[PDB]
């Protein structure tokens, strides 16, 4: 029964947590986040299989707070649960401690919740990987990623999804050759889209992407027209 | 707390219900001469006009509490059918001014009923022997007959437990 | 003000229909005595809201009684005991026929069955006159030198109606809170009869 | 096998099987659809006649929440009623706190969080219904559809139930060839009859112009016009 | 205190004095009494519950989207006088007042605090619908200056917050400026 | 501390008339002049409220919740299963008695029952309720009832009281209340609920024909 | 998959609820029918005395049970409590449709929460209110259906088919309480494989008729 | 109110008045101030006793023997002390206690004794009991003593009177020796004894 | 129930205890390594003996003592032996994650009474009265001895007869309970004189 609840197998492995990682890939979309000089950009594939869907609602990027944004890899119900909990925690921190929750504090709090699910047998882990992006008041642009095991760490740039390894190789190549040195968020968004295209070998329309930009005192999501401007700027 | 696919959930006490009273009897069946027969209370009172013949003690405590509560609340003797739905195989017998003398064993009112390992033959004997014109004397004697093959509730006496030697001699 | 009188195979429960606050009349016809069925008549005066709550809860209790006993006519003593256990800044009076067919008036826990009982503001104006006229208190047979008391005969429902009307007319005369109309409910073997009599409206 | 006997368990594939079985329960339900018109939403459901003894209309299936949200679902109808009761409680609480009718996206999120919560614990069962719901609020018309997993999205048109596939095939044609509310009612009737291939058509709708944004049922002459158009 | 919210042609202007007193002693003569509970929603007590209301409004903004000024007043009411003034492009500038009774009243302009008593007649005669920004500012200056001149527990500098579709603009007027009005 | 005073009403041969002034007084200060205190709850019911305005708004919220919840799973909520004046009155009385943290109000629920009987009942913060051919609340219970009771002294006067007679009586009672009540306003709302015509709700009525000329002699 | 109420089968069925439905088919048939003015319950009891199938909730409503009687007593207790609450808080006679929906919402809880079991009793509820005469059929799954007539319990299919073919007739029976009872007793007879004065039970409610039950000699004239 | 209970060779005599007043208004002159808890227990008061009788019925059903007077008085005193101006005697007979009187009051005290008088007229009842009481009184003498002791309090105490209800607690249960109207009783006593000389008539 | 029957097995492995009640007293006797070096008073008038899991007997005895004192605190009268037996049986019933593997003999006298009482309780929560009884290991063997040496029409008349019968049955500690709160364990030398005799 060690594979049905979060208890150790003879190998010391928590098989339910390992299966929870597998669930994260079942939405089959890839995302990447890069840090600019003064901003953070998140790119995510907005795959819309059904023509009757309203694409405006299909979205895995969440505005957790004025400054923090979150992109989720995994089932949308669990993703929305995580987003609601993160919004609640950010508001409670702003209330208790008088200032906006830092990105990494939110990541730690969410990873501690995830760890709790990983040790109490009553509760299953959420099958979502949470990637928080913000421009911290102190540390500047930040990317923190949390996983079902309760592990989290900060990133220079990160990718997540079935083709995570390829996007990671692309980013590693660029970082070796070269944060992304840019003067405004549009250029870093264009760079992120370019590397997404190259890693995935697939061109994107304004409908295939969802983009979130973290800037000083605002995390905002690009509308389809804004993403169209970026795609034109790349086509040029 | 589960249903079977066929839809259903997964001593010998003999009673007669006459129009002059309801008679109950039990085989004490002491396991040894050391067990004090005085303490084999297999027929018990539930109320001044209600008794039953046998989890037992707890259910009887709750039934007695319900009956006294009803009497306190309404100053009326609880209806036997109401008691059955407000409270081991049971023979519950009592009297009231609504349905008179009743005997119950989910519940079903019975003119006469028996329970236990001898129930299968006892019910046939009752079916052959019982008649509406039974006076309390013949009812008591037929109780003893079926046992060999006491207590009563009356409008004057209420519930009382049994002179029993005199009835075996009269038997 | 309410008034219950038990008699020979009848009982009456009467009360004035006026409703007041401070020195102002709220309504001139607010019925105060209720025919509760089962040949029981009841009235819960005192603080209005608690009386209403008590009546409502007693109606709930009697509905449950009817449920458990297959719509059996609730006896006056059973109703009285129920009303105790339910008990509110209220002075309840219930009247009806007992199991022997005699008139019965119950006053309220601590219920007391009594031959007559008044309640409300003008109970003090009404009750002594009823003691004198129904119970013949302080009356002796003439010429006996105070040795032989006047026998306690029973009054017919007509005489009791007259007594109630005159008692409430006097209370209306001398009590400012009493009297716009008189509501009298007679309980007998036939059922519950309702009578209304006008009183002075000042 | 073995990993699908409980609600909290992930399979080695990463899938929660009890939710997929709840989806299987939905696909057995009768066909219900929703259509978003330029200023409102239209709901329709095929009400299968079990016998001639059913009263011809009074077994209503579409449900209103507050006054501006309408809900229709397929699958275990009692679970749909349970979900709608929770939705009514949520809307009532929101109106109590904030004096304003709950926005449709907010209501959708509340219902999704409730349905998803039933997939967290082994002690509770997933909902056996996919619920099309929508209405009109300060931001216009919204149409949503829950799945037993708690997943939901906004839709231009939605269909679920046994005939969901045919209904979807005709919703695609609606969207590709355009739809005002008046026309939307008739199109909903046509789509329900096409998907049916005895039953009762029940239609409802909520349009800013034609109902002032409040949810109303289609009755009388408009209902019959939809009937004869669809038969036409 | 002497707080004053006035809707005008382009939005709402919320203004207050800067004096706080404990008895006759002025505890603080430069207090900022205008409280930003949400981006375009500002309130004015006539502190802990202000934090609670900001908490609940951030929670609302995260769950259900941008709250209205009526939403803010509702949150005050359900937690509970207050003048809640705000702006949005759907409703434009709004003023709500929540006197001690706890009832909520949407108004064209609102005055509160001890100083408001002395300028009920003045504001009634001088207020006009859809004034310009300059006219609204002058109106508030004169009203609050009279309230300060009469109310002992009111004084110091006059602060204003101008809420408009353009943005939030803060103004300050010193006694050397308004006492001569 | 914000309160409204006057609610008066009488029943007549075909329905009920109810009126109230549009004022909210902050103690001695006539602070708010637009408060509406008559709350229609359908074509057959109006709930006039007096006392604390915050509790008045609370009660309005509860009434709208009633009208919302009654329509759930109720296809006849429009005509046959619609809320009666009596159902609303009993709900409100239950609310007041539950809170009684009492709601500091007095409420007159006026309307016509589905069978055509005029409904007119009172309830206050103590849960005290009564019915009468004429009802008034607060300061009107002393000045308005004597005037209205001259029109309908008893039950038998109701069928002899026409629409216009009751209307003019109510208007005159508002004029007298404005004369002699310090916490009253010149502006009032009036609602007629006729069994034939249904709810006929008038707003922003004016107290007119006041007499002041005799002041010059004093 | 069938060992508990919170598990779906791989095909989406709830085996425990289907077993609870099978529980009803064990009990004796009860029949319900109505015109516009009157609604009638005709129940076949079984013995020893016969168990009473009819239960009275109000002067305006009552019900009969098929299956586990204890589940019936619980559901009818809850129903009476809800009617009492409605009269307590509104002086409003609880509508039959609303009472049916309350039962539906109570029964559904047991089919979704672990620890309990579905109610193994099916109920026929008849009542009269402002909307007229009503007849509801309640099932363990929580489903409630408003019907012109129905029969539940063992071998009820014969009575149900008879009611189907007789529907055109007994709908027209307005102002004739006895003819409805006659049609109902004729219907329940089709479910036998016989009726007696002591075995049969009848209940009726309508415009002028409060809910009343006939047993013993009272049903002799209808047999 | 005036209630007295005293023990003598023949059991217990319990005598009470009947008056009840709301201030100066005499609400009733026929109130029953003795509750018959059991055929062997009398509760004298000057809900509680309904609770005690319910507990006694439960004890009778559960246990083999009747509830003791000590147990009943302790139940009542515990209940009163939980809700801590009232005074009661629990008078009864038990085969293994004999005749027993327990005094219980609103303060929570519980006293076993031979003689107790309670209520506004208690001092006047004591004046007669203390001077005329003997252990070896005959049953008739003890009944007369209780009647006379309540008569004294009824005469001198304004809030005491109406009628005297006599109870006798014997080995076979309590005996109700009837109701005596103080109006008739005062005069009868005055002629037969020659007492109350100051009273005209 | 299965767990209750396994608790009965645990009881049957426990050391045997025996009780006999005579005309005037109840006598309780009990069957007590090289380097190692039963009857519990519940109140001054009632004693409780047990056989089975010793650890569980302490929970039972503590609960019984607390109830015996709480009865005197709530009601003046000390507990009856019957009442205490009923309470102990209730506790045993209620804990049927696992039952007590304990059966008890409860003996003593009623308050201000002189008829000796002897009762038994078993893990299921059943209880009954006995004139002589035994529990524990080989309880059947010695109960069969009592069933023929104890006479219902001539029970033991004095302390000597009760102790003699108890010692014969056991063949040792002996507790004699007598009215008016007289509980005493016999001396080792006295028990030796009985055994030799």
From Swiss-Prot, chain B:
Its main location: cytoplasm. It holds the Pfam family Proteasome_A_N. One of its GO terms (biological process) is proteasomal ubiquitin-independent protein catabolic process. InterPro entries: Ntn_hydrolases_N, Proteasome_alpha, Proteasome_alpha-type, Proteasome_alpha_type_5, Proteasome_asu_N, Proteasome_sua/b. The modification Phosphoserine is found at residue 32. SUPFAM superfamilies: N-terminal nucleophile aminohydrolases (Ntn hydrolases) (SSF56235). One of its GO terms (cellular component) is proteasome complex. The modification Phosphothreonine is found at residue 31. The 26S proteasome consists of a 20S proteasome core and two 19S regulatory subunits. The 20S proteasome core is composed of 28 subunits that are arranged in four stacked rings, resulting in a barrel-shaped structure. The two end rings are each formed by seven alpha subunits, and the two central rings are each formed by seven beta subunits. The catalytic chamber with the active sites is on the inside of the barrel. The proteasome degrades poly-ubiquitinated proteins in the cytoplasm and in the nucleus. It is essential for the regulated turnover of proteins and for the removal of misfolded proteins. The proteasome is a multicatalytic proteinase complex that is characterized by its ability to cleave peptides with Arg, Phe, Tyr, Leu, and Glu adjacent to the leaving group at neutral or slightly basic pH. It has an ATP-dependent proteolytic activity. Present with 17100 molecules/cell in log phase SD medium. Belongs to the peptidase T1A family. The gene is PUP2.
Swiss-Prot record, chain E:
GO terms for cellular component: cytosol; nucleus; proteasome complex; proteasome core complex, beta-subunit complex; proteasome storage granule. Its main location: cytoplasm. One of its GO terms (biological process) is proteasome-mediated ubiquitin-dependent protein catabolic process. GO terms for molecular function: endopeptidase activity; threonine-type endopeptidase activity. Keywords: Acetylation, Cytoplasm, Hydrolase, Nucleus, Protease, Proteasome, Threonine protease, Zymogen. It catalyses: Cleavage of peptide bonds with very broad specificity. It comes from the Eukaryota. Gene3D superfamilies: Glutamine Phosphoribosylpyrophosphate, subunit 1, domain 1 (3.60.20.10). Pfam families: Proteasome. InterPro entries: Ntn_hydrolases_N, Pept_T1A_subB, Proteasome_bsu_CS, Proteasome_sua/b, Proteasome_suB-type. It is found in: Cytoplasm; Nucleus. It is an enzyme of class 3 (hydrolase). The keyword Protease applies. The active site is at 1 (nucleophile). Its EC number is 3.4.25.1. Belongs to the peptidase T1B family. PANTHER family: ATP-DEPENDENT PROTEASE SUBUNIT HSLV, METALLOPROTEASE TLDD. The side chain of Thr-1 acts as a nucleophile, and the N-terminal amino group acts as a proton acceptor. Present with 7250 molecules/cell in log phase SD medium. This is Proteasome subunit beta type-1. It comes from Saccharomyces cerevisiae (strain ATCC 204508 / S288c) (Baker's yeast). The lineage of its organism: Eukaryota, Fungi, Dikarya, Ascomycota, Saccharomycotina.
Curated annotation (Swiss-Prot), chain F:
The gene is PRE4. Keywords: Cytoplasm, Nucleus, Proteasome. Belongs to the peptidase T1B family. This is Proteasome subunit beta type-7. It is found in: Cytoplasm; Nucleus. One of its GO terms (cellular component) is cytosol. The keyword Nucleus applies. Present with 16900 molecules/cell in log phase SD medium. Its main location: cytoplasm. The 26S proteasome consists of a 20S proteasome core and two 19S regulatory subunits. The 20S proteasome core is composed of 28 subunits that are arranged in four stacked rings, resulting in a barrel-shaped structure. The two end rings are each formed by seven alpha subunits, and the two central rings are each formed by seven beta subunits. The catalytic chamber with the active sites is on the inside of the barrel. Interacts with CIC1. One of its GO terms (biological process) is proteasomal ubiquitin-independent protein catabolic process. Non-catalytic component of the proteasome which degrades poly-ubiquitinated proteins in the cytoplasm and in the nucleus. It is essential for the regulated turnover of proteins and for the removal of misfolded proteins. The proteasome is a multicatalytic proteinase complex that is characterized by its ability to cleave peptides with Arg, Phe, Tyr, Leu, and Glu adjacent to the leaving group at neutral or slightly basic pH. It has an ATP-dependent proteolytic activity. PRE3 and PRE4 are necessary for the peptidyl-glutamyl-peptide-hydrolyzing activity. The keyword Zinc does not apply.
Swiss-Prot record, chain I:
The keyword Phosphoprotein applies. GO terms for biological process: proteasomal ubiquitin-independent protein catabolic process; proteasome-mediated ubiquitin-dependent protein catabolic process. CDD domains: proteasome_alpha_type_7 (cd03755). SUPFAM superfamilies: N-terminal nucleophile aminohydrolases (Ntn hydrolases). This is Proteasome subunit alpha type-4. Disulfide bonds: none annotated. SMART domains: Proteasome_A_N. The 26S proteasome consists of a 20S proteasome core and two 19S regulatory subunits. The 20S proteasome core is composed of 28 subunits that are arranged in four stacked rings, resulting in a barrel-shaped structure. The two end rings are each formed by seven alpha subunits, and the two central rings are each formed by seven beta subunits. The catalytic chamber with the active sites is on the inside of the barrel. Interacts with CIC1. It comes from Saccharomyces cerevisiae (strain ATCC 204508 / S288c) (Baker's yeast). It holds the Pfam family Proteasome_A_N. The gene is PRE6. InterPro entries: Ntn_hydrolases_N (IPR029055), Proteasome_alpha (IPR050115), Proteasome_alpha-type (IPR023332), Proteasome_asu_N (IPR000426), Proteasome_bsu_CS (IPR016050), Proteasome_sua/b (IPR001353). It is found in: Cytoplasm; Nucleus. The keyword Repeat does not apply. Belongs to the peptidase T1A family. The lineage of its organism: Eukaryota, Fungi, Dikarya, Ascomycota, Saccharomycotina.
């Amino acid at each position: 029964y060690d594979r049905h609840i979060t208890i150790f197998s003879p190998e010391g492995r928590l098989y339910q947590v390992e299966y929870a990682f597998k669930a994260t890939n079942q939405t089959n979309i890839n995302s990447l986040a890069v840090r600019g000089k003064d901003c953070t950009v998140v790119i995510s594939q907005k795959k819309v299989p059904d023509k009757l869907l309203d694409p405006t609602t299909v979205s895995y990027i969440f505005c957790i707070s004025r400054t923090i944004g979150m992109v989720v890899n995994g089932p949308i119900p669990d993703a929305r649960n995580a987003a609601l909990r993160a919004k609640a925690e950010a508001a409670e921190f702003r209330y208790k401690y008088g200032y906006d929750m830092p990105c990494d504090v939110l990541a730690k709090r969410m990873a501690n919740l995830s760890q709790i699910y990983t040790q109490r047998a009553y509760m299953r882990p959420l099958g979502v990987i949470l990637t928080f992006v913000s421009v911290d008041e102190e540390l500047g642009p930040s990317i923190y990623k949390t996983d079902p095991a309760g592990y989290y760490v900060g990133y220079k740039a990160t990718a997540t999804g079935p083709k995570q390894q390829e996007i990671t190789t692309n980013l590693e190549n660029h970082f070796k050759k070269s944060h992304i040195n840019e003067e405004s968020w549009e250029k870093v968004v264009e760079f992120a889209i370019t590397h997404m295209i190259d890693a995935l070998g697939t061109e994107f329309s304004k409908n295939d992407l969802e983009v979130g930009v973290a800037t000083k005192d605002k995390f905002f999501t690009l509308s389809a027209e804004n993403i169209e401007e970026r795609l034109v700027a790349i086509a040029e | 707390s589960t249903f079977s696919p066929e839809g259903r959930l997964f001593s010998t006490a003999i009673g007669i219900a006459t129009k002059e009273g309801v008679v109950l009897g039990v085989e004490k069946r002491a396991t040894s001469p050391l067990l004090e027969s005085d303490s084999i209370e297999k027929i018990v009172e539930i109320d001044r006009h209600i008794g039953c013949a046998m989890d037992a003690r707890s259910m009887i405590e709750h039934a007695r509490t319900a009956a006294v509560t009803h009497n306190l609340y309404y100053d009326e003797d609880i209806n036997v059918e109401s008691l059955t739905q407000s409270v081991v195989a049971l023979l519950i017998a009592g009297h009231d001014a609504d349905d008179g003398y009743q005997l119950f064993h989910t519940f079903y009112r019975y003119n006469a009923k028996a329970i236990g390992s001898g129930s299968e033959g006892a019910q046939a004997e009752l079916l052959n022997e019982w008649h509406s014109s039974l006076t309390l004397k013949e009812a008591e004697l037929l109780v003893l007959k079926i046992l060999k093959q006491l207590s009563c509730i009356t409008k004057q006496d209420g519930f009382k437990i049994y002179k029993t030697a005199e009835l075996i001699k009269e038997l | 003000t309410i008034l219950g009188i038990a008699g020979e195979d009848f009982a009456v429960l009467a009360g004035d229909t006026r409703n007041i606050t401070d020195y102002s009349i709220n309504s001139r016809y607010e019925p105060k005595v209720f025919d509760c069925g089962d040949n029981i008549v009841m009235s819960a005066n005192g603080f209005a809201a608690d009386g209403d709550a008590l009546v409502k809860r007693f109606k709930n209790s009697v509905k449950w009684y009817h449920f458990d006993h297959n719509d059996k006519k609730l006896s006056i003593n059973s109703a009285a005991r129920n009303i105790q256990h339910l008990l509110y800044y209220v002075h309840t009076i219930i009247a009806g026929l007992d199991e022997d067919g005699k008139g019965a008036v119950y006053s309220f826990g601590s219920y007391e069955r009594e031959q007559c009982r008044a309640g409300g503001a003008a109970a003090s104006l009404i009750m002594p006159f009823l003691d004198n006229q129904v119970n013949f208190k302080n009356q002796y047979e003439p010429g006996t030198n105070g040795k032989v008391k006047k026998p306690l005969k029973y009054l017919s429902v007509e005489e009791v109606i007259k007594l109630v009307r005159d008692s409430f007319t006097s209370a209306t005369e001398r009590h400012i809170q009493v009297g716009d109309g008189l509501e009298i409910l007679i309980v007998t073997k036939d059922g519950v009869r309702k009578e209304f009599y006008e009183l002075k409206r000042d | 096998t073995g990993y699908d006997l409980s609600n909290s368990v992930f399979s080695p594939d990463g899938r929660n099987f009890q939710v997929e079985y709840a989806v299987k329960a939905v696909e057995n339900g009768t066909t219900s659809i929703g259509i978003k018109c330029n200023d409102g939403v239209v709901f329709a459901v095929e009400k299968l006649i079990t016998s001639k003894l059913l009263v011809p209309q009074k077994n209503v299936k579409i449900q209103v929440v507050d006054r501006h949200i309408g809900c229709v679902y397929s699958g275990l109808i009692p679970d749909g009623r349970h979900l709608v009761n929770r939705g009514r409680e949520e809307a009532a609480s929101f109106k109590k706190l904030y004096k304003t009718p709950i926005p449709i996206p907010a209501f959708a999120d509340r219902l999704g969080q409730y349905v998803q919560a039933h997939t967290l614990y082994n002690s509770v069962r997933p909902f056996g219904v996919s619920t099309i719901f929508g209405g009109v609020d300060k931001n216009g018309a919204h149409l949503y559809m829950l799945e037993p997993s708690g997943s939901y999205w906004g839709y231009k048109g939605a269909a679920t139930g046994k005939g969901r596939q045919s209904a979807k095939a005709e919703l695609e044609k609606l969207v590709d060839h355009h739809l005002s509310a008046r026309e939307a009612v008739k199109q909903a009737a046509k789509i329900i009859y096409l998907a049916h291939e005895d039953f009762e058509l029940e239609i409802s709708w909520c349009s800013l112009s034609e109902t002032n944004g409040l949810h109303k049922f289609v009755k009388g002459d408009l209902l019959q016009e939809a009937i004869d158009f669809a038969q036409k | 205190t002497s707080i004053m919210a006035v809707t005008f042609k382009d939005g709402v202007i919320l203004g207050a004095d800067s004096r706080t007193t404990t008895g006759a002693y002025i505890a603080n003569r430069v207090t900022d009494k205008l409280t930003r509970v949400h981006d375009k929603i500002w309130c004015c007590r006539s502190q802990a519950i202000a934090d609670i209301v900001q908490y609940h409004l951030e929670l609302y903004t995260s769950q259900y989207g941008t709250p209205s000024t009526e939403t803010a007043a509702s949150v005050f009411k359900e937690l509970c006088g207050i003048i809640v003034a705000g702006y949005d492009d759907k409703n434009k500038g709004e003023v709500y007042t929540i006197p001690l009774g706890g009832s909520v009243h949407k108004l064209p302009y609102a005055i509160a605090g001890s100083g408001s008593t002395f300028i009920y007649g003045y504001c009634d005669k001088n207020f006009r619908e859809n004034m310009s920004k300059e006219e609204t500012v002058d109106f508030i200056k004169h009203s609050l200056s009279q309230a300060i001149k009469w109310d002992g527990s009111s004084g110091g500098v006059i602060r204003m917050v101008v809420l408009t579709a353009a943005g939030v603009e803060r103004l300050i007027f010193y006694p050397d400026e308004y006492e001569q009005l | 501390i914000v309160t409204g005073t006057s609610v008066i009403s009488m029943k007549y041969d075909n329905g009920v008339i109810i009126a109230a002034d549009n004022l909210g007084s902050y103690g001695s200060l006539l602070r708010f002049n637009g408060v509406e205190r008559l709350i229609p709850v359908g074509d057959n019911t109006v709930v006039g409220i007096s006392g604390d305005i915050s509790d008045m708004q609370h009660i309005e919220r509860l009434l709208k919740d009633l009208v919302t919840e009654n329509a759930y799973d109720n296809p006849l909520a429009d005509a046959e299963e619609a809320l009666e004046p009596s159902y609303i009155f009993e709900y409100l009385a239950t609310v007041m008695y539950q809170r009684r943290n009492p709601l500091w109000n007095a409420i007159i629920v006026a309307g016509v029952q589905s069978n055509g009987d005029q409904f007119l009942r009172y309830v206050n913060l103590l849960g005290v309720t009564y019915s009468s051919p004429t009802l008034a609340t607060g300061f009107g219970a002393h000045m308005a009832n004597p005037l209205l009771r001259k029109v309908v002294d008893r039950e038998s006067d109701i069928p002899k009281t026409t629409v216009q007679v009751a209307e003019e009586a109510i208007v005159n009672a508002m004029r007298v209340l404005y004369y002699r009540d310090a916490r009253s306003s010149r502006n009032f709302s009036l609602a007629i609920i006729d069994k034939n015509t249904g709810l006929t709700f008038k707003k922003n009525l004016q107290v007119e024909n006041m007499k002041w000329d005799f002041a010059k002699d004093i | 998959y069938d060992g508990d109420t919170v598990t779906f089968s791989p095909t989406g069925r709830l085996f425990q609820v289907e077993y609870a439905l099978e529980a009803i088919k064990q009990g004796s048939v009860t029949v319900g029918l109505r015109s516009n003015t009157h609604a009638v319950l005709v129940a076949l009891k079984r013995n020893s005395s016969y168990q009473k199938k009819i239960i009275k909730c109000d002067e305006h409503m009552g019900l009969s049970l098929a299956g586990l009687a204890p589940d019936a007593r619980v559901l009818s207790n809850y129903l009476r409590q809800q009617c009492n609450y409605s009269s307590l808080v509104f002086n409003r006679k609880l509508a039959v449709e609303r009472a049916g929906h309350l039962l539906c919402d109570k029964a559904q809880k047991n089919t979704q929460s672990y620890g309990g079991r579905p109610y193994g009793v099916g109920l026929l509820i008849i009542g009269y209110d402002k909307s007229g005469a009503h007849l509801l059929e309640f099932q363990p799954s929580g489903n409630v259906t408003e019907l012109y007539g129905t029969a539940i319990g063992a071998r009820s299919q014969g009575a149900k088919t008879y009611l189907e073919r007789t529907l055109d007739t007994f709908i027209k029976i307005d102002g004739n309480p006895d003819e409805l009872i006659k049609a109902g007793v004729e219907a329940i007879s089709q479910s036998l494989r016989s009726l007696t004065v002591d075995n049969l039970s009848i209940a009726i409610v309508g415009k002028d008729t409060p809910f009343t039950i006939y047993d013993g000699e009272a049903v002799a004239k209808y047999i | 109110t005036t209630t007295l209970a005293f023990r003598f060779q023949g059991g217990i005599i319990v005598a009470v008045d009947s008056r009840a007043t709301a201030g100066n208004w005499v609400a009733s002159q026929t109130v029953k101030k003795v509750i018959e808890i059991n055929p062997f227990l009398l509760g004298t008061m000057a809900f509680w006793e309904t609770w005690l009788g319910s507990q006694c019925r439960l004890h009778e059903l559960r246990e083999k023997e009747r509830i003791s007077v000590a147990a009943a008085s302790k139940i009542l005193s515990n209940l009163v002390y939980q809700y801590k101006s009232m005074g009661t005697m629990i008078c009864g007979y038990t085969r293994k206690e004999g005749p027993t009187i327990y005094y219980v009051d609103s303060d929570g005290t519980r006293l076993k004794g031979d003689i107790f008088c309670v209520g506004s007229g208690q001092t006047f009842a004591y004046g007669v009991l203390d001077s005329n009481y003997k252990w070896d009184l005959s049953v008739e003498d003890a009944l007369y003593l209780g009647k006379r002791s309540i008569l004294a309090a009824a005469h001198r105490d304004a809030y005491s009177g109406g009628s005297v209800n006599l109870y006798h607690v014997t080995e076979d249960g309590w005996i109700y020796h009837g109701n005596h109207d103080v109006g008739e009783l005062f005069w009868k006593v005055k002629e037969e004894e020659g007492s109350f000389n100051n009273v005209i008539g | 129930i299965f767990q209750v029957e396994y608790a009965l097995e645990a009881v049957k492995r426990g050391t045997c205890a025996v009780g006999v009640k005579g005309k005037n007293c109840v006598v309780l006797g009990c069957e007590r390594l090289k380097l190692q070096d039963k009857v519990s008073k519940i109140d001054s008038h009632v004693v409780l003996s047990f056989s089975g899991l010793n650890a569980d007997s302490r929970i039972l005895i503590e609960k019984a003592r607390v109830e015996a004192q709480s009865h005197r605190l709530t009601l003046e009268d000390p507990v009856t032996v019957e009442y205490l037996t009923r309470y102990v049986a209730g506790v045993q019933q209620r804990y049927t994650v696992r039952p007590f593997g304990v059966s008890t003999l409860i003996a003593g006298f009623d308050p201000r009474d002189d008829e000796p009482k002897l009762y038994q309780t078993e893990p299921s929560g059943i209880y009954s009265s006995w004139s002589a009884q035994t529990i524990g290991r080989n309880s059947k063997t010695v109960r069969e001895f009592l069933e023929k040496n104890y006479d219902r029409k001539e029970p033991p008349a004095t302390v000597e007869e009760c102790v003699k019968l108890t010692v014969r049955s056991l063949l040792i500690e002996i507790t004699v309970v007598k009215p008016d709160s007289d509980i005493v364990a016999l001396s080792s030398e006295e028990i030796n004189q009985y055994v030799t005799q």
